[PDB]
Symmetry: C2
Subunit: 193 residues, 2 copies
């Protein structure tokens, strides 16, 4: 017969890992990588505990209201599986590892000789302001920051799952125009022609 106690220890281990995932502070790079690993462990434990309960009900007699309920579990996990492999396809698309870490909607990216940059972004917004600080030089858009290696390009691309939009550097803002020393603003406009 199938034993009962393995389901109980799986629930307790799932509770430990879920309550630990919910209080990660998500501030630095290693904290984001740690929380993504703990999220993967949580979904593995949830998948294990639900197939274990379905096997128990197979041995005891599984009802039809429970048939479509466990069917709902497996269907939503299949949709989640195709989302993860699309995230890996997006990770290949931008050629940087930030699609697995940062969990945003869109990603702004341009290619250099030392780095293939990518910075998180929330929507298509018709104008993007990249602010590079003086000296550490680092490009930031809305708080998310990536360190400077090579230099700026004219056309940057906003990537997502199924879309891609291009922006051209229309004009740049020095410190003479604004008065804010030690920064420089690059202003991009969306090209549709």
């Amino acid at each position: 017969s199938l034993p009962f106690g393995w389901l109980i220890v799986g629930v307790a281990l799932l509770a430990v890992f879920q309550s630990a995932s919910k209080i990660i502070t998500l501030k630095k790079r290693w904290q984001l990588a740690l929380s993504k690993g703990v999220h993967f462990v949580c979904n593995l434990l949830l998948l294990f505990v639900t197939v274990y309960s379905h096997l128990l009900l197979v041995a005891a007699g599984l009802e039809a209201p429970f048939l479509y309920l466990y069917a709902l579990v497996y269907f939503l996990q299949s949709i989640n599986f195709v989302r993860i492999i699309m995230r890996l396809w997006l990770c290949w698309k931008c050629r940087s590892k930030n699609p697995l870490l940062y969990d945003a909607n869109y990603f702004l990216c341009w290619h250099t000789n030392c780095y293939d940059y990518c910075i998180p972004y929330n929507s298509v917004t018709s104008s993007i302001v990249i602010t590079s600080g003086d000296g550490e030089h680092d490009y930031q858009i809305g708080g998310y920051t990536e360190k400077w290696e090579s230099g700026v390009k004219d056309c940057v691309v906003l990537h997502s799952y199924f879309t891609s939009d291009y922006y051209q550097l229309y004009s740049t803002q020095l410190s003479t125009d604004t008065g804010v020393e030690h920064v420089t603003f690059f202003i991009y406009n969306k090209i549709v022609d």
Copy 2:
């Protein structure tokens, strides 16, 4: 005696709600509100299923390696509980409902006569560029967007749990300077004096 089957149906209902929370697209306001509600349901089901398992082990004899495991579950849930009431304190602090919805690190906010604005933000960054579009007028910082009611202020505040930082509008950028029509850039510098 305590029945075994309620733990199984609680596990199955937790699986449905967890697999449904993981594939919300998080693009509009009602989708963010829906996913936060489903997250609350998930933690209620997890709390219920772990105290049910602890009660069954109390009836059967609970081992000391399992004593500290369920102690770990309850301790991490206490840390999660004080985090939620701090999110509500932050929701009272900037006087808008976006701390419950958007799940970012810092929030930029200024008060008007028709609206108390608040826009998500990731870190303290020494310069903030708020871009208001022409006509719908809407203030956006990095993709997150809020509709325009009254007008702009000189001093905006970046709020968090324990911190608060102020930024002054150093100079503004029209369409004459950049060439990007139908937008206007407000450039803020951090005040330390």
